[PDB]
Design a binder for these strands. Structure first.
Lengths: 93, 278, 292, 93, 281, 288
DNA sequence: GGAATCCATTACT
DNA sequence: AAACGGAGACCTGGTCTCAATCTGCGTGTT
DNA sequence: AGATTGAGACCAGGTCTCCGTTTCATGAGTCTTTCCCGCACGAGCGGGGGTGATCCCACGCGCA
DNA sequence: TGCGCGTGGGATCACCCCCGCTCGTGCGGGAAAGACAGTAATGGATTCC
């Protein structure tokens, strides 16, 4: 049964404690838990609308040989699809 | 959907009732809501409860719970039970998770009709003992049958594990006892009592519409718990006490094994099907 | 057969020897547990486990509500652990003959002077839609608030008419206490007579007995007294909760619920909405201790 | 294959890149991947000794209700169980 | 075990050949190792390839790779293959992934015996075409008969998917990749060519030991790859040629389609499962 | 029959028209690729894909090694797209009659016509035992016995660590050499069952002549208070700089495989910054 | 009887 | 010509503490 | 009183640069057999979940 | 303003989608002994101090 991890940075403290009802806090700004497809999709909407100006990314199991895919919003670490693979991209200044 | 607000969520956001964990046991700590988070502040630190994946929460002696914490827990659908010593003390539930009342309205029709109550009681008993035939049998001699068989199940299990008895049958009201078997029975039982209370409120079924028991607002949960206590919580309750040694927390050992019993027995998926056919 | 709907806010409560104590900023009081019928727990309150065990055995109904019961949050068991009202509700709702009886009864309070006990449901709901148009129109001209038609959107609270936003907020404000008494009295909120299919269905039917007397007069008044750019959701709650301070409305639901359930007059209990500092002189002669 | 996530902080930069061969870096000190039981143990064994003076905690699919469990060493947040349930404990400072 | 250091790990700590991804295409980037990690660096930024689960790390045009990068990739066991236009160009590999040379020595027995070579060479065909009998067909006829069959499959394609066909069977040595149709099939072809080389070095097999292709050290690769040459990638890549639009790069989307064909066809599972049968283990 | 072994380190390689362009700090080197067979790419080197484009055409083999082969990292194709050498290795290993002949030939390279495989193996243990005894007295060092932990190098005798460090250098060099030639390290004659079985068989030729004296030498001058694997590595680095070892080894492989003298290929090292006078007449432009 | 020596006595590579 | 370890050095971003504020998140005959 | 927000202090971890130091992490004198560890496929395979349809008032409103 | 329904609108009874499929096998992987043709160290047989 699928697993999902969510990471955050520079987000309002109201939301940081909010996912503690759905996730746990292994480390600062790092939340992890187990959902299905429907619950995970709905919650990703919540962190999308309430984060305001901040950093939000998540990992969830997918239908690719890597076994997971990436969804990012206002993220410094973007995601680039190398012909069907999610790889973390880090822009350099 | 509309705007999303921290501390509030729809039923669709919350997980399905039988896809969550059973219970947690919290003592000597203060439950508060900080930064829209249900938190348990013990003597040495604080922990965060994933209320979305939690069925029922338990409160033991020497704990404090804040007003904001209650509504935050109630929103998630996790009911509250004050698990003091000598058994259950008090209940607490929030808004029903289920939007519709089709389950609830059907329960009202069945419970108010004497012949329907007879038929439902026939269904309730045969889940406990499918072998027996109860085609022609009424309410008065029912209570004799379950009471005797529960006592017989209690006796044979006691000798199988060699535990002393005071020839007592467990009820959550007016209970007592200093012998380790007394609280071992209570601690294992109360998790079942808390679990059924949470799920019955999540499905929208009122706890006062009992069939076997009647006379209090929590009659229904007692009747449903009667169906599963003999099968599940009683064997571990005796087992853990016999296995436990002197100078040890029986409850921690007791509650740990009951959680495994809830898992392998598929109790959550089973009873919701059982409530579906009742 | 007297129930105390005592309200607690901005205080800590615990247990000392055998009676619950309160640790409000004003002082410390020692109300006996026997006197407590229902604790309307409001904002800024914590509950100790030792208090609950002293409250569980006495059958007290612990309900978590908003400021003066403006909203409903959660509750425990019914008062005195009884369920006679709930089982009465189930019996009176399963059959149509009593359903006909009670449904016409509610409209009787809706129209105290007009007899509609013979009108069917179709005519009852039809004439129910007639009165709501008049009441909106009559109050619109009284407060000089322009009224067009009840227009709103549950998915869009912000994008609503100021009269509508106040009206929606006022109903939700009343929905709080009327659901609190239902849980306090142990009635099933799901089992509604006119409205059916929602867990609050019984709540709307009972709340409609007071919507035309409290919420709508308040909502129209708030709409007139409101400047542009100021949110009225808090205003409507604050204005409504002022009417709940005295608690005179609270007794009305307690009496009405017995009347709808046809409880015998001897069995019709009446609640007394006490408050700590509002009735200090009234509690002391019974044996309550007040310490600064 | 079940998911796994690793967190790190105050760790020598040699390890911070070495683990990226296995699990990508969505955020600072966060790594995600889909591993079986055997592979994950050896990687955790690798972080066991080369963590230096820092924090490393890991999560993976388990056989409980929440479906995951935690392992921590030299961690700011210890992991405590409430009757067989893994919950994150943040000690009072 | 002993101390574990960055960049060094036993084969046990690393996923088996089956549990790894297929490949990644790279173009116009520098492969440098920083903080003991392979880092493909482009103009905009850097991407950290998770080498541990990479089948073969394809390398395209206009790219530079350092020295420690190859060592780090070789430790992981991912093969390195240099590809551009007009076909594949170069191959590379690490030391190995399996410490047992049982597969190699068994292959050595099979190749030397002329009787054994004919037995296995015929057995290529019924894995390619299970509906035909090659029990009495000689080695010389194998080259000609399979040479016509590979052409027949392409000829069937031309009238099927409604797109012109140049009538050029893929020869990786100086291939003609002018028309956009050719690069689509070649880029698809090199994807398995890298994959075949990736597993062979992982299992310890030597590419030099030839079965049907002879004369070059990549003979075994050209034979194992020929087993799945037309079954999977050719229909998928040629169907991509049918669904061709203007204004986009054909290679990227064609490579993506080959990926989906590979995962749908379970090529990685099928290929090694064959080699176990092919060695009578 | 001409094979070029070129070592490049601390440099960078590109392509302009048809020749590799070494961009080492000294200057720019323009070696044509039409006569290059091996690129012993050392530590800290950068190769361009365009350079790899040409090297495939000429059959040139690429090998990535440490300090001129002190360790082996990766390789590529073989010399001039030739697999005949590996084919003969496969033929020579299947039938035990061929296997016994080359195995006996390996021992005599270090009476042999009657010793069998187990008989040969015991003598090699006997001779290697005497060799340790001889050098222990020759270098006046206290060698107790070869005791080693494969997974614990830090805890061990300095002499034992010296031999372990010295030996592992040798396998890297031969593995780099054998991979370029197109053979397979798995197919071993005496040693069998490992991916480097052929490596440990061939490397036994030069353990006594080269590595063992080096390990004993560094141990003799070893001072307590520092690591010696680094010291042994450097003492092998300079020994491998000359390249006469590689010349011997490539010939030995041809002899071990019974390669005809006419078909035997001669390989020599090419130091770009040390053999400038030789490379200029062949068409090389040198810049500073 | 025991030491020195040889080959068994025992045992290392 | 890479590439990593040690010593700054600077920064954001997370965390704690102290006023100020509100009691809380809005549908139910049009 | 409890919880949220905001402003402000504060400081540990991250990241960047600069300087210095390396080209590295280290087996097999010898392979064979055998006791622990395996995880994908073989045999008949029906319990779930995603969702069309629809009720009956919500949004809005037309004639009366 | 009296009177209801034109668009919905999502749970829910139940419809068709899914693999159904989880324990044993047996196929490879271990690791530790255990061989295999040699010395080295040392003690009883033999003879001498």
């Amino acid at each position: 049964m699928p697993m999902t991890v969510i990471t955050l940075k520079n987000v309002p403290q109201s939301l940081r404690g909010d996912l503690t009802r759905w996730m746990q806090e292994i480390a600062t700004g790092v939340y992890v838990g187990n959902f299905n497809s429907r619950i995970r999709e709905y919650l990703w909407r919540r962190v999308q609308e309430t984060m305001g100006a901040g950093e939000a990314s998540m990992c969830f199991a997918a239908r690719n040989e890597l076994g997971y895919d990436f969804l990012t919003e206002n993220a410094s670490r973007s995601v680039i699809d190398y012909d069907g693979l999610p790889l973390i991209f880090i822009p350099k200044e | 959907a509309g705007p999303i607000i921290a501390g509030k969520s729809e039923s669709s956001e919350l997980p399905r009732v039988e896809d969550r964990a059973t219970f947690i046991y919290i003592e000597h700590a203060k439950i508060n809501r900080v930064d829209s988070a249900v938190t348990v502040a013990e003597a040495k630190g604080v922990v965060r409860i994933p209320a979305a994946m939690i069925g029922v929460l338990l409160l033991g002696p020497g704990t404090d719970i804040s007003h904001r914490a209650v509504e935050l827990l109630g929103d998630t659908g996790t009911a509250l039970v004050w698990v003091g010593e000598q058994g259950v003390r008090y209940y607490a539930s929030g808004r029903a998770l289920a939007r519709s009342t089709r389950f609830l309205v059907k329960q009202a029709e069945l419970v108010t009709n004497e012949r329907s109550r007879l038929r439902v009681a026939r269904r309730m008993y045969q889940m406990r003992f499918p072998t027996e035939d109860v085609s022609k049998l009424t309410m008065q001699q029912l209570r004799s049958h379950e009471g005797a068989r529960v006592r017989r199940k209690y006796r044979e299990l006691s000798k199988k594990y060699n535990v002393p008895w005071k020839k007592r049958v467990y009820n959550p009201d007016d209970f007592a006892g200093g012998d380790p078997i007394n609280q071992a029975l209570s601690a294992a039982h109360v998790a079942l009592y808390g679990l059924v209370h949470s799920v019955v409120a999540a499905l929208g079924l009122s706890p006062g519409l009992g069939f076997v028991h009647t006379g209090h607002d929590r009659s229904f949960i007692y009747d449903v718990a009667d169906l599963y206590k003999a099968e599940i919580t009683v064997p571990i309750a005796f087992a853990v006490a016999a296995e436990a040694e002197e100078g040890q927390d029986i409850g921690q050992l007791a509650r740990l094994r009951t959680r495994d019993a809830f898992v392998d027995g598929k109790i959550l998926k089973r009873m919701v099907k059982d409530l579906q056919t009742l």
